[PDB]
Amino acid sequence: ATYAQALQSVPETQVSQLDNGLRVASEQSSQPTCTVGVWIDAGSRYENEKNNGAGYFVEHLAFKGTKNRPGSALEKEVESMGAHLNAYSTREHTAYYIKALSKDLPKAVELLADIVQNCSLEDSQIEKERDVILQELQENDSSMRDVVFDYLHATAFQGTPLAQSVEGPSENVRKLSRADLTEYVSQHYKAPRMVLAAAGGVEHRQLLDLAQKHFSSLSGTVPAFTPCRFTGSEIRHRDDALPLAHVAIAVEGPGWANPDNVPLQVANAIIGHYDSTYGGGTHMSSTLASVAATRKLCQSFQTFNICYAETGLLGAHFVCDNMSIDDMMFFLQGQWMRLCTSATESEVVRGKNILRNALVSHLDGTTPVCEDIGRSLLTYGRRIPLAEWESRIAEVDASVVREVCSKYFYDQCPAVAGLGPIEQLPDYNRIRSGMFWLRF
Amino acid sequence: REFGHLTRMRHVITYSLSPFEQRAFPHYFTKGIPNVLRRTRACILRVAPPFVVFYLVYTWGTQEFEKSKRKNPA
């Protein structure tokens, strides 16, 4: 095996389609366990101002009870056979996946139908979950990372559904009724926008039979979203009582398909990530990370590439003390402009290797593989095989990075969200002026 | 006295906008003119009277000089 035969030997994910539009997809393997899940194309991006937060509410109510399985009965099946049921709802996706033994695949799929098709949405359950969601919102206020990322989305996609948080405003939480949830599950859990994805030791024929036997009686065969408008701005939630100051600066990134995703990730891999409790520190080849470790500017930073269907945020988020925001912002902008102006071959090779490690290591275990299947089928319309990813990364070079970063970073108005003791944070004019070089 | 340790402010949120996405002369006359009128109305009663007094004194002194420089019938 020379890593080429290795990639070629990865089992192929068969994809089918029911009459309802259910894209049944599976990736057989040898493990005795499996992860079977349903990926919905619902999320806050598809929610108006009044309906905002209904997706999170429905996700919460999903596992409580079903019409066929009243209340804890649904729970009882999950634990009694050792399965781990879980759900996650981001801004443009929802998913319910049940990790279970390959033997129990016939049962799990049935449950996966019951959770998605025949929910309960009981009124007393709605009241209890309303209280729980309120306390969970007060929890989410605690950590600065999620708060800062929601601020970034609000100030970058202001005036668009993308600005809406996943959980929604607390006002909507109290004022969401059972009718709204029923309408949401009726008009957003439709059959065409569904991916039943399974990994592990499941054969595609059995998955197709189970889907055709349990998911057949679903929707037949509309809120198809609108292109959101990036609006470079800044939000400063100056709160000096917080210990550290979380900043996130992002530019309008690429879409989901948008082949420029492959170079940009490589470019981001050049900047990398770092925090206090790392290893080499002052020797890590990422110049920004080496500077941070040498001068102890920050307790953390990372480069994110949040990309949605038609747009996306590409940038960096760092956590540092109250009197190092300016220096680290300068060094971050310097790394960005260096990549746009002069990328150099060696850094590009390091980025290519790092991205190869990302894609390969991320796709291990049944849960990440099934998640990749669902997300790829929903976004790319296919499952990009690892060989295709390898070829696309191989095509990347110094010139490609220098051009792609230039198209997205150089002289672009960024969106900034800072929270905490952010007095040091440079004024938006200084940040914007950092995007361009008078030497270049 | 540098940015970072000037004061302690909490619970304030400021929203801004890139200069490349907003007009540099937003309603320069639709609200510029009424604002100017309010500004001058709220200050003329305190600014004008001294200068108007000076103008009266100037003109009186100048004409006093002029008609004191004439010839006296004698």
- Candidates A236, A422, A436, partner chain B, best to mutate (most B CBs within 10 A): A236
Q: Are B64 and B56 in contact (CB under 8 A)?
A: no
Is residue A263 a contact partner of residue A396, using CB atoms and an 8 Å limit? yes
Positive or negative, the CA dihedral A47, A53, A58, A63 is positive
A196 touches A23 (CB < 8 A): yes
Closest CA to A175 of A260, A301, A49: A49
Cα distance between residue A129 and residue A330, in whole Å: 45
- A307 DSSP 8-state letter: B
> Given an 8 Å threshold on Cβ–Cβ distance, is B14 in contact with A432?
no
CB A308 within 8 A of CB A256: yes
Of A45, A150, A145, nearest to A92 (Cα)?
Answer: A45
Work out the end-to-end distance of chain A between its first and last CA atoms, rounded to an integer number of angstroms: 46
Burial class (CB in 10 A: 0-12, 13-18, 19+), A341: middle
Structure-solving method: cryo-EM
Whole-angstrom distance, CA of residue A163 vs CA of residue A153 = 5
Query: How many beta carbons lie within 10 A of that of residue A402, not counting itself?
Result: 19
Cβ-based neighbour number of residue B34 at 10 Å:
10
A423–B14 CB contact, under 8 Å: no
Q: What angle do CA A338, A342, A347 make, to 5 degrees?
A: 85
The dihedral region occupied by A311, where left means phi > 0, alpha psi between -120 and 50, and beta the remainder, is beta
Nearest CB neighbour to B5, from listed A239, A323, A325:
A323
Task: Tell me whether residue A59 is one of the annotated catalytic residues.
Answer: yes
Is residue A65 within 8 A of residue A3, CB to CB? The reply is: no
Neighbours of B71 (CB within 10 A): 5
* Number of Cβ within a 10 Å radius of residue A270: 26
Burial class (CB in 10 A: 0-12, 13-18, 19+), A305: middle
Within A259-297, strands assigned E span 274-275
DSSP H helices, A216-284, are 261-271
Task: Please tell me the distance from the alpha carbon of residue A314 to that of residue A102, in angstroms, as a whole number.
Answer: 39
Beta strands in A71-150 (DSSP E): 84-89, 94-101
Tell me whether residues B18 and A235 touch, CB distance under 8 A.
no
Rounded distance between C-alpha atoms, residue A244 and residue A301, angstroms: 12
Q: What angle do CA B27, B31, B36 make, to 5 degrees?
A: 125
Beta-sheet pairing, A233-238 with B12-17: antiparallel
Chain B positions contacting chain A at CB under 8 Å are 3-21
CB within 8 Å: A413 and B9: no
Structure tokens at A345: 């071959």
> Is the CB of A323 less than 8 angstroms away from the CB of B6?
no
User: Which of A332, A144, A147, A142 is closest to A244 using CA atoms?
Assistant: A144
Q: Is A136 helix (H, G, I), strand (E, B) or coil?
A: helix
3-state secondary structure A336-347: HHHHHHCCCHHH
Locus of tokens 């929707």:
A219
Q: What residues of A are in contact with residue B8 (Cβ under 8 Å)?
A: 240
What's the one-letter identity of residue A90? T
A202: buried, middle or exposed (CB in 10 Å: 19+, 13-18, 0-12)?
A: buried
Catalytic entry in A27, A47, A59, A347: A59
